[PDB]
């Protein structure tokens, strides 16, 4: 399924080239510009654990998730991954725990040492 496919067929987008964050572009977005550091980014996402459980979805809340890019407000994989996206793009990200919640995990759903799968849509980005 999609997690296996991004695991085996994704592109490493880390600066360290350590395969900690792999990406597939599922829907090509608009033009060439990606967000810049500090921009307000608006995303929709779905996250799955490596046991197949869905642990979060913005679609189910009927509102996007909004954060400031590149400020460590989200897991490292999201700062790195969203920074590579164009407006209107949908991608898959496969995140090793060193770019997610590490050995700590995150209550209630994310265990220690968890590899995570996301589908992310970049709805919009704006400077403030």
């Amino acid at each position: 399924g999609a997690p296996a496919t991004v695991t085996e067929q994704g592109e490493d987008i880390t600066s360290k080239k350590d395969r900690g964050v792999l990406k597939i572009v599922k829907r090509v977005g608009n033009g060439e510009e990606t967000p810049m550091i500090g921009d307000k980014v608006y995303v929709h996402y779905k996250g799955k654990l490596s046991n197949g459980k869905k642990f979060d979805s913005s679609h189910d809340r009927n509102e996007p998730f909004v954060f400031s890019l590149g400020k460590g407000q989200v897991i490292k994989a999201w700062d790195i991954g969203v920074a590579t996206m164009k407006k209107g793009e949908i991608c898959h990200l496969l995140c090793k725990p060193e770019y997610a919640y590490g050995s700590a995990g995150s209550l209630p759903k994310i265990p220690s040492n968890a590899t995570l799968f996301f589908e992310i849509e970049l709805l919009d980005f704006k400077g403030e």
Partner: peptide, 5 residues
Amino acid sequence: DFPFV
């Protein structure tokens, strides 16, 4: 918690 941190 997620997706903060």
